[PDB]
């Protein structure tokens, strides 16, 4: 054990990164909200096209955060919908001055969790470009990618120490065989990830499709691109100019990608609440504050809200 | 005068029967359910006008068999208008009036090169909830009014107002609300404010009018789409009535749960009327330098859904 790592919320994201870190020799402890008794006896298994089959058995699984030991890094892989009840779990599992890394999508996530996080804890964001989902209980299906873009949000660190901490988190993933990048601007990096999540998550639910049919059809492809330009323009209006041709890079990488159902697709099929607040409502309100309209995203958001309310 | 119904669908059947029930001489052309009508007749189940039956009914299997008609009502889906052109020509009398009881934009101009220039081409915008039930049975749930406008033909401006008013009198004397519109293109834009949101969202959200109006998010979406259509119409010079969006929303609130034309078409595998209802007003708005992002996105999603198995 070089670093003790706690995983708050052990879904596909939390289980994957926690297992990859554990396979690198770190002491990883998994907090299970919904899957404890299954995962505890079965273990954690990884079906990965990138890294091959991996397994962690037995798992250091816990059903209550108080049972967990003080960890140096807390990785939150849970959905942003349960972030309001996250603070007592993090505080219960955190070693003094622990680093909290939200492996979560959307916008404004860290800012909404900080009020109830002790000032002595560092708060970081991690934007995961990864194709992963839950198969059988305790089994993790990894189809592609896995890179993590880390950014610092808040905490007791000065500017030099902030860069060192982000670099430290990136080294954890890199030594685990995962690509990872220290980002200089977490909020800019969150806008960059929205360019993929906003069209693909919502259209996969709305059109009940996956990435390959969405990219194959010419009309859905133009719709994705127009939505991407809305997010790019909303980011620009709020002060963040994204890389040139960023939409083309996302479109090109998604074509090469295997057929993938986004996490929101799985959420809707399993009846789980969709991450509309972080992925849609928050960027819509930020753009509205800057006087920038996102008509397709706003309509896509209204449709998803309708679909979630329908029987 | 003599009235022919080219394609006795839900629209043509309803308006043909109402005209015939008022004493007019109506001649129905049946293309795919001639067998059932030519015995039992045509029956109407109307929550407004009640139960009416036409028996016997002047039914024809071929447009060649029909007598020359002075009025030709066309109520079929716009996708088959090209195939319908020989039918209209065969049943048309000299100087006949062709009334396209069809939705969308640019419908008459796309049919005009296939019709003789001696014929008058009119548009009829039907604010009506109607669908085919049993063979020979027309189910009418609400409304039924027709707004008539002149498109093309040999008539001068004075003769154009007389012909539109003559057609409006046909329907009004049959017990239907009907208005003569001075601008057919403006009249088509105002009907698009309903068809564009309700027809597409009913397919996209797999919903009908009542659940779309009961949910606040779908209602906000419909209103935003309506404002895009109102803005695109104004960008092309046509000022729509004040509070027109709230007007349509109010009439949709009162009417019973309705599955639009496009919903039934998508469910039964029929090709959707995307060209006339979405592609044409989008291209017309683009030429006027006005964007309709929600309508464009809606059109793209519908085309995707149509291409899916």
In 3D space, the residue among A16, A77, A10, A84 whose CA is nearest the CA of residue A51 turns out to be A16
Q: What is the DSSP letter of B62?
A: S
The domain segmentation of chain B, as residue ranges, is: 2-181, 186-307
In 3D space, the residue among A228, A14, A273, A259 whose CA is nearest the CA of residue A128 turns out to be A14
d(CA B60, CA B64): 9
Partner-chain contact A206 B204, CB within 8 Å:
yes
B97 is known as an active-site residue: no
Q: What is the DSSP letter of B79?
A: G
The tokens describing B66, both together, are 């029909």
Largest CA distance in chain A: 53
Burial (CB count within 10 angstroms: exposed 0-12, middle 13-18, buried 19+), residue B39: exposed
Partners of residue B295 in chain A, C-beta under 8 Å: none
The tokens describing A135, both together, are 């198969």
Q: What is the DSSP letter of A307?
A: H
CB-nearest to B300 from A219, A298, A307 is A219
**Which neighbouring-strand residues pair with A152?**
A124
d(CA A270, CA A279): 19
The tokens describing B299, both together, are 């059109």
Give the CATH architecture of domain B186-307. Orthogonal Bundle (1.10)
Beta carbons within 8 Å of B65's beta carbon, 6+ residues apart:
none
The percent helix, strand, coil of chain B (3-state, each to 5) is 50, 20, 30
Does the B2-181 domain belong in CATH 3.40.50.620?
no
Question: DSSP characters for B191-248?
Answer: HHHHHHHHHHHHHHTT--HHHHHHSHHHHHHHHHHHHHHHHHHHHTT-PPPTTHHHHH
Contact residues, chain B to chain A, C-beta under 8 Å: 204-205, 207, 211, 215, 217-218, 220-221, 224-225, 293-294, 296-301, 303-305, 307-308
In 3D space, the residue among B134, B127, B133, B139 whose CA is nearest the CA of residue B176 turns out to be B127
**Which neighbouring-strand residues pair with A184?**
none
Strand pairing class (B25-29; B2-6): parallel
- Calculate how close chain B gets to A208, using CA atoms only, in Å: 9
The tokens describing B113, both together, are 């090169």
**Distance between start and end Cα atoms, chain B:** 47
- Calculate how close chain A gets to B126, using CA atoms only, in Å: 28
In 3D space, the residue among A164, A46, A166, A206 whose CA is nearest the CA of residue B206 turns out to be A206
Angle formed by the axes of helices A186-206 and A295-309, nearest 10°: 60
Give the CATH architecture of domain A4-184. 3-Layer(aba) Sandwich (3.40)
d(CA B279, CA B303): 11
Burial (CB count within 10 angstroms: exposed 0-12, middle 13-18, buried 19+), residue B227: middle
Burial (CB count within 10 angstroms: exposed 0-12, middle 13-18, buried 19+), residue A160: exposed
d(CA B244, CA A182): 54
Q: Mutating which of B216, B297, B305, B306 best tests the A interface, going by the most A Cβ atoms within 10 A?
A: B297
Please give the torsion angle defined by the CA atoms of residues B201, B202, B207 and B208, in that order, rounded to the nearest 10 degrees. 120
In 3D space, the residue among A126, A132, A134, A129 whose CA is nearest the CA of residue A172 turns out to be A126
**Which neighbouring-strand residues pair with A127?**
A149
Contact A245, A277 (CB under 8 A): no
CATH number for region A188-309: 1.10.1040.10
Partners of residue A217 in chain B, C-beta under 8 Å: 303-304, 307-308
Partner-chain contact B297 A223, CB within 8 Å:
yes
d(CA A169, CA A176): 11
The tokens describing A294, both together, are 């996102």
Quick check: helix, strand or coil at residue A274?
coil
The tokens describing B192, both together, are 């698009």
Backbone φ/ψ region at B304: left (φ over 0), alpha (ψ -120 to 50), beta: alpha
Beta carbons within 8 Å of B17's beta carbon, 6+ residues apart:
B26, B42, B44, B52, B54, B138
d(CA B168, CA A261): 54
- Calculate how close chain A gets to B238, using CA atoms only, in Å: 23
CA B235 to centroid of chain Cα atoms: 24
CB-nearest to B215 from A207, A213, A309 is A309
């Amino acid at each position: 054990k070089q670093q003790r790592i706690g995983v708050i919320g052990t879904g596909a994201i939390g289980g994957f990164y926690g297992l990859m870190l554990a396979h690198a020799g770190h002491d990883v402890h998994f907090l299970l909200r919904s899957e404890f008794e299954a995962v505890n006896r079965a273990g954690l298994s990884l079906n990965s096209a990138v890294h091959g089959f991996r397994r962690l058995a037995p798992v250091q699984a816990y059903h209550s955060a108080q049972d967990m030991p003080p960890c140096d890094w807390l990785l939150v892989g849970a959905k942003t919908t349960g972030n309001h009840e996250l603070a007592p779990l993090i505080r219960a599992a955190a070693a003094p001055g622990a680093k909290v890394l939200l492996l979560q999508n959307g916008l404004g996530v860290e800012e909404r969790l900080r009020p109830l996080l002790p000032e002595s804890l560092h708060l970081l964001g991690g934007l995961c470009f990864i194709c992963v989902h839950r198969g059988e209980p305790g089994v993790i299906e990894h189809q592609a990618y896995g890179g993590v873009n880390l950014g610092y949000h808040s905490g007791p660190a000065d500017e030099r120490r902030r860069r060192e901490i982000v670099e430290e988190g990136a080294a954890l993933f890199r030594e685990s065989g995962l690509e990872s990048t220290a980002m200089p601007d977490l909020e800019q990096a969150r806008w960059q990830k929205l360019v993929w999540n906003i069209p693909y998550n919502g259209l996969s639910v709305l059109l009940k499709s996956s990435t390959a049919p969405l990219m194959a059809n010419a009309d859905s492809r133009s719709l994705i691109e127009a939505i991407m330009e809305e997010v790019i323009g909303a980011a620009g209006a709020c002060g963040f100019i994204l890389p040139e041709g960023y939409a083309d890079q996302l479109l090109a990488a998604t074509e090469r990608m295997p057929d993938y159902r986004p996490s929101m697709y799985h959420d809707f099929a399993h009846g789980r609440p969709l991450e509309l607040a972080a992925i849609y409502a928050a960027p819509l309100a930020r753009a509205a504050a800057a006087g920038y309209r996102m008509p397709r995203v706003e309509a896509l958001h209204q449709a998803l809200r309708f679909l979630e309310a329908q029987p």
